[PDB]
């Protein structure tokens, strides 16, 4: 600590006084991981390995809930031509928890895939499938030419070429109403400057790379704003109390000391907040008990030193710290320990005889180097 004061003051000589040095902070004893004991895996075989997808004008929307995800099977699959996320990293998906998950499944031409991304425009993004500017989620696609292409052209997949106005994010319009591009009104099936609104893709095995059919699944899930229904493949650990721990309760990551709380959460409630609108209590997601959350002790470290021209002996004040914490941080010899109202004072001898103040410690206490 004397070399720490010389370092902090940028000087090889230090005058008699009390100087601030790197803050004391009690470290996690162990981690805690808690999630509900759900087992069944999500419908990723029925979403990504389905026999066929719908046309882009009638894109399918499947709900994924009450299941465990395994995104290493999907991301590591060589069949996927792109697996690109816009509000999460693909490697974080297995280390992450999901509120609501929706799979949007449809087929488009590889040249049109460029319009599926958030913030885009053009006939696909404008008339059949738009993502929001701040889209959080992942776009997954693979070449399906062997599955969905025919030598004369598999025209069974359609898009929307005509529409009265542009559509909003995640709007789906299946309607086949005839569109009038000219100012003159029309009736029946077709006429001058009057068009059928949908158009078929020219899906042929002779098409160049980009002109071939790609199957697209877009995961448009939401994070950290509602009760979770899809989750990472994490095993729940044992739960401990009366110790400083790195806890995680259904994604509630933090470091603190857990204790049994008297806060009466209502049947619909799971997390408890303080006047500052921050979490101060949590109900365990598997065992229905409420734990009071308080972070570990920490504060500045003050070094008390006579002059360098006097002595190399120094004393250390752990500000805002209960003495209990010192042996926990196994000066650990002690036999000079004393709890002051400023914090835990170590390396200094407590003397009952009152003297005039020399080096100020705080809360009525002062130190000095004496015989």
């Amino acid at each position: 600590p004397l070399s720490e004061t010389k370092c902090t003051l940028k000087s090889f000589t230090v005058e008699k006084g009390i100087y601030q040095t790197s803050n004391f902070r009690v470290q996690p004893t162990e981690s805690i991981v808690r999630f509900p004991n759900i087992t069944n895996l999500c419908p990723f075989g029925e979403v990504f390995n389905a026999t066929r997808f719908a046309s882009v004008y009638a894109w399918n929307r499947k709900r994924i809930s009450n299941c465990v995800a395994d995104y290493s099977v999907l991301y590591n699959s060589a069949s996927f031509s792109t697996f690109k996320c816009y509000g999460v990293s693909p490697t974080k998906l297995n280390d992450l928890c999901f509120t609501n998950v929706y799979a949007d499944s449809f087929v488009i031409r590889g040249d049109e895939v460029r319009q599926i991304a958030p913030g885009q425009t053009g006939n696909i993004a404008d008339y059949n499938y738009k993502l929001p500017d701040d889209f959080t989620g992942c776009v997954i696609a693979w070449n399906s030419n062997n599955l969905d292409s025919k030598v004369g052209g598999n025209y069974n997949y359609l898009y929307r070429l005509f529409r009265k106005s542009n559509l909003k994010p995640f709007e789906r319009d299946i309607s086949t109403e005839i569109y009038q591009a000219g100012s003159t009104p029309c009736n029946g099936v077709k006429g001058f400057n009057c068009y059928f609104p949908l158009q078929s893709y020219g899906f042929q095995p002779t098409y160049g790379v980009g002109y071939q059919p790609y199957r697209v699944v877009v995961l448009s899930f939401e994070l950290l704003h509602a009760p979770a229904t899809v989750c990472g493949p994490k095993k729940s650990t044992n739960l401990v109390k009366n110790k400083c721990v790195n806890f995680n309760f259904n994604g509630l990551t933090g470091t603190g000391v857990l204790t049994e709380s008297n806060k009466k959460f209502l049947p619909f409630q799971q997390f408890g907040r303080d006047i500052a609108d921050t979490t101060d209590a949590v109900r365990d997601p598997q065992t229905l008990e409420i734990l009071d959350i308080t972070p570990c002790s920490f504060g500045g470290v003050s070094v008390i030193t006579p002059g360098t021209n006097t002595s190399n002996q120094v004393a250390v004040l752990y500000q805002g710290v209960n003495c209990t914490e010192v042996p926990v941080a196994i000066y650990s010899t002690g036999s000079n320990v004393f709890q002051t109202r400023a914090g835990c004072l170590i390396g200094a001898e407590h003397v009952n005889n009152s003297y005039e103040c020399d080096i100020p410690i705080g809360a009525g206490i002062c130190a000095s180097y004496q015989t």
Binding site: D274, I275, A276, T278, T294, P295, G299, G300, Q319, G320, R341, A342, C357, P360, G362, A363, G364, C366
Partner: peptide, 26 residues
């Protein structure tokens, strides 16, 4: 005539003259 403050890195230091020491000078 506090807990959240210390929990967010805010530390309040005690005065050198306590509420009795200030009253003793008075």
């Amino acid at each position: 005539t506090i807990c959240a403050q210390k929990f967010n890195g805010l530390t309040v230091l005690p005065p050198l003259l306590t509420d009795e020491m200030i009253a003793q000078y008075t």
